[PDB]
């Protein structure tokens, strides 16, 4: 499990094309050739679950736990664990009175359900303010009936956007005649890894309060900052929006805790928004599924292994950022072509000048097995995105292989 | 476990109201009093999984299997398994060339994604033809931008609707100026338990072909007919629509195989519709989740237990329909107040005349612990729906309690 070929040979090889993105074939060809493959382009930890988690899944054989459950909020032993755990972990305002609900099919799907909820009763053209680049929010915005109007997040900024970026996007809503339905923020940001500021959050809150527009917080990486980076807690700083029906946060558990297949998460915030989400806008569409996974996670999350695993992941993200930096320096990259902000486990690489970046991307897989992400800034300048949150057993050889590849890159 | 109170005490008791339907409180009060509770209103088998299925989850510890998958169609070992299994079980037309895809968050959710895919590119008002009553299709139709235009399915018909019912619905689309986007059918029908006819399916196919409208088949209960009832196979009879991009079926595995929490199912049919569903209209919304559950179910489906479990469920459903008929005759109900058609595991009870049916429904829980479903026909006449697909360990005491309740009813 020191590389990722096994994952593609099992989950991608099929008698149908597994997806039509060009990277699908790059990954297949590398994996089927049984050559080392390193997937640094998607933020997963597929190589292992945390200690104790699979055991917790098996322990739930003690009682029947594979039927549908009779709560629109998820399994109560999980829901109340998340309420306590999130309030402590994110340092929620004790004077706010939020409601917490389980999401059991992915927080991207919870965002979709939240956005279609906010389209209800809105005949007029509507906008969602969202970061660009963002983690797949754009299609959920379009598919739920809104216009995506993005605010720029520069890759170079260790703190992500500034209020001026939000204002520019708001002014495009003004001139396009689009009613703003939601402001979506991602303070520990995928893909750039910025840690967003109280300044920016206050600008978001002021716009929310002025226009009566809810804020949607994606906290997937709140718990995965670098060791020397204290995450900005948007729910703490925006606590006054809870009682105004202007705040909902979503936070995947399966990302931080290396169980992406279980698709468990928390939806929390204003009680009207969250109760409407949970029943009307989620449980009419999907079943009350995930009984066993929720019970296993309630037992696991209530114990001692979550803190140990989180501390491990944050120490790895820090060490891997440092190892990538020195590896790429030894390969000949200039210091300023390697950025790591510590708000989420991503390192950003400026691709070598003058080559077609998609070609460099493919040749890195073909020649050395490493698949990186590709993002672009507001002027379409390309950046490679390197996910750092793999176990060291995979990241150490992946880093070495990327060092081999980057020595073939020309920096002038 | 010979009742259901354990399930409500674990999954409904909380510091928030679990849902605002009045039945939530009836269920809580009975369960929290630790008096026998029998949930016969939802088609689940929460009391137990089939032999070998939980063991299959353990066996998957042998390799890492809790990350995201790199296929928009689900885990290949499951998808391949379902393709072969469905083609044999439903006797698909060997001349058709369908595509099969895994659904991993519920087939009601797959229907939602299919319906919103069919709204794409349609500014004009559009309709979905659907049965009334149906299993929750109506809100997916509305929430994906269509107008629900229902065709009547009479509870009394052991074969469900006739072509005239479909035509009446189509004519309402015509007079309202609604463009038909989809015809949804449920041949082994929830809630009435009819087994729909080749006649009706032929009328559906003729309408689909004439108007170029895809058919969406819900086959949740295809494998759960009574012992003496061969299910009508819509995909077999509609095989010619596959190549025309006019057929998609959805089939939950988790109902038949008593693992509803795993929310695994199959989406199958026209390759353009199914590939567009799988990627564009599902994987941009949902993560490629369910690795371990899909792997466990693929392994389990490769053994001998699934066929044994299915035979057992069908035997139980048939025995339970018989036991309810005898129990309710002894309680004083007329024969025409107790219907079981055998197309799915439901018995229909006509409530006592002159009582308020929601009151009778509540009092049956309060006094005897039995929760029945409530449906109505096209003239709003009420019927209780009794789910039969529970283990006998639960159903036998449930039937005794329902007999006790029904003896208090006036016929």
Author numbering:
A (entry chain B): 16 to 427
B (entry chain A): 16 to 426
Task: Give sentences from the paper.
The biosynthesis of the lincosamide antibiotics lincomycin A and celesticetin involves the pyridoxal-5′-phosphate (PLP)-dependent enzymes LmbF and CcbF, which are responsible for bifurcation of the biosynthetic pathways. To understand the molecular basis for the differences between LmbF and CcbF, we solved the X-ray crystal structures of LmbF and CcbF with PLP at resolutions of 1.7 Å and 1.8 Å, respectively. In the active sites of LmbF and CcbF, the PLP is covalently bound to the catalytic Lys270 and Lys260 residues, respectively, to form internal aldimines.
In the LmbF active site, the N1 and C3-hydroxy groups of PLP interact with Asp233 and Asn205, respectively, and the phosphate group of PLP hydrogen-bonds with Thr122, Ser267 and Ser269. Moreover, Trp150 interacts with the pyridine ring of PLP by π–π interactions. Although the residues lining the active-site cavity are in comparable positions, Asn205, Phe236, Leu83′ and Pro302′ in LmbF are uniquely substituted with Tyr195, Tyr226, Tyr72′ and Tyr292′ in CcbF, respectively. Docking of the external aldimine intermediate of 4 into the active site of LmbF and 50-ns simulations showed hydrogen-bond interactions involving the carboxylate group of the cysteine moiety of 4, the C3-hydroxy group of PLP, and Asn205. The dihedral ϕ angle between the Cα–H bond and pyridine ring of PLP is stably maintained around −70° to −90°, indicating that the Cα–H bond is aligned parallel to the p orbitals of the conjugated π-system. As a result, the ε-amino group of Lys270 remains within ~2.5–3.5 Å of the Cα H atom, and the distance between the ε-amino group of Lys270 and the S atom of 4 is less than 3.5 Å in the calculation, suggesting that Lys270 probably acts as an acid–base catalyst to facilitate the C–S bond cleavage. The in vitro enzyme reactions of the LmbF L83Y, W150A, N205Y, F236Y, K270A and P302Y variants revealed that the β-elimination activity is abolished or dramatically decreased in most cases (less than 10% compared to wild type), except for the L83Y and F236Y variants, which showed 21% and 58% activities, respectively. Although most of the multiple-site mutations at Leu83′, Asn205, Phe236 and Pro302′ of LmbF merely reduced or abolished the β-elimination activity, the LmbF L83Y/F236Y variant catalysed the decarboxylation-coupled oxidative amidation to produce 9, as well as the β-elimination reaction.
